[PDB]
Subunit: 277 residues, 2 copies
């Protein structure tokens, strides 16, 4: 009886294979589950292209590229566990909904933004000036054709005030969240997951609002008060099956202290490794 | 006791890639033994260096490098400078703005001294950042929010909206005296012993390629170009480029390759003698 393979999808301003980031996660997992095969997804020919593609490659293409890669890797045929960091969380959810084959078994979301974001106060890495540019571009015109198509963070930019512009113009997050209409296969495929685990960082200064990490968001028509998944219409009308999943024990809501993606060895071993054996 | 060399990389590149600026460094160190080469890094990491080549204001980059050169002891006696691609016009801006310590020879390797009016292809594995920058430039290169943050916009040069360019460009229009004549820009540039310009005859990056020899599209349209010596920049000699040309201070080299594509033999033969 072997351990399931793990597929990792990194977040923004990061690559597959930085020893200090996804490299450390891979080693950490390999030590506590021996013989495990870990695929850290790279979208690009080099590590630097991987990093700039995390800002500038259309996520719908990224998802197709990753589906093709997963279809080609023989070690994943019998199924895999998936773990996304930051924006990689909602990307791997997208993979679960769009290509359910080979089967993802446990989706683990580490500080993902499943209802998107409405602000960009800080980028991970040494990325301040690219961040400043992205922020300005988003606040100026996140929902123009030309910006939607070419800026990754625009494609899960979720304005709770101008909600109907978000529904009509988001080329990624609005689709995977059933905002424009109910894709039945998305619901079916998300419900086929054994566990959907969501990690929230209580002192997170990157993700706005932090509630997006637990599939919650700003209440419609304003941008101060947040509401949890259970009070949103995505849940109560159950467009993705999250209410059926919540009732069936399939959803796990984990919270840790610390800023974005800052997690100790103790906690990781205590709460994430159990989902990977 | 050979003069030290200061290198400024181009767009989509860093100080220290073995296949790029690292290869230049190792090559110059072998041919000129005991030479001190400073490959400029504008950022904490190599990764920030690359993305600052796109998103850190050039005026902030130039004042930073000048401070970094003034504090460097090995350069107080003087130094040679070699700029690759945009590093070309950047180091020229150091020549014009930061005369102490004294730059001796300026080598522009595919620099864009009259800027660009197009971005059809970017160096390295960077096609998607290039798409975004291209669309942004063709939409709002001269809006205040873009100018202050996007490097390529700061040497974007619209010949059809020449009036708008002179008025809004916060870098190229300054160092090319498009607003007025900063008398020390001129005086400082003319203090170089040699200002060498390398043009790539198969360049598919730089639009228009003659910008590498300080030429550009004729004002008012974007089909026909004109060389340095027919432009009003040279007519009225706002930078001292005519006096330098007549004094034999301008050296123009052409090589047959695409952008930054040159052989070791050609380099040893034509570039090393200025170092």
């Amino acid at each position: 009886p072997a351990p399931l393979p793990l597929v990792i999808w990194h977040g923004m301003g990061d690559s597959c294979c930085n020893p200090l980031s996804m490299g450390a996660i891979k080693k950490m997992v390999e030590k506590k589950i021996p013989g495990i095969y870990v695929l850290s997804l790279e979208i690009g020919k080099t590590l630097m292209e991987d990093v700039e593609n995390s800002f500038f490659l259309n996520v719908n293409s990224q998802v197709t590229t990753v589906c093709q890669a997963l279809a080609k890797d023989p070690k994943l045929q019998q199924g895999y566990n998936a773990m996304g960091f930051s924006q990689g969380g909602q990307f791997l959810r997208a993979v679960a909904q769009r290509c359910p084959s080979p089967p993802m078994i446990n989706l683990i979301s580490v500080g993902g933004q499943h209802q998107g974001v409405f602000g960009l106060p800080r980028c991970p890495g040494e990325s301040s000036h690219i961040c400043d540019f992205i922020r300005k571009t988003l606040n100026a015109g996140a929902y123009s054709k030309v910006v939607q198509e070419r800026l990754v963070q625009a494609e899960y930019w979720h304005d709770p005030i101008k909600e109907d512009v978000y529904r009509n113009h988001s080329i990624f997050l609005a689709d995977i969240n059933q905002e424009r209409g109910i894709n039945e296969s998305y619901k079916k495929n998300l419900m086929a997951l054994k566990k959907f685990v969501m990690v929230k960082f209580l002192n997170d200064s990157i993700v706005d609002p932090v509630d997006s990490e637990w599939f919650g968001f700003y209440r419609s028509g304003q941008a101060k008060e947040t509401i949890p998944l259970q009070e949103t219409s995505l849940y109560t009308q159950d467009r993705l099956g999250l209410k059926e999943m919540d009732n069936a024990g399939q959803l796990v809501f984990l919270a840790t202290e610390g800023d974005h993606l800052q997690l100790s060895e103790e906690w990781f071993y205590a709460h994430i490794i159990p989902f990977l054996g």
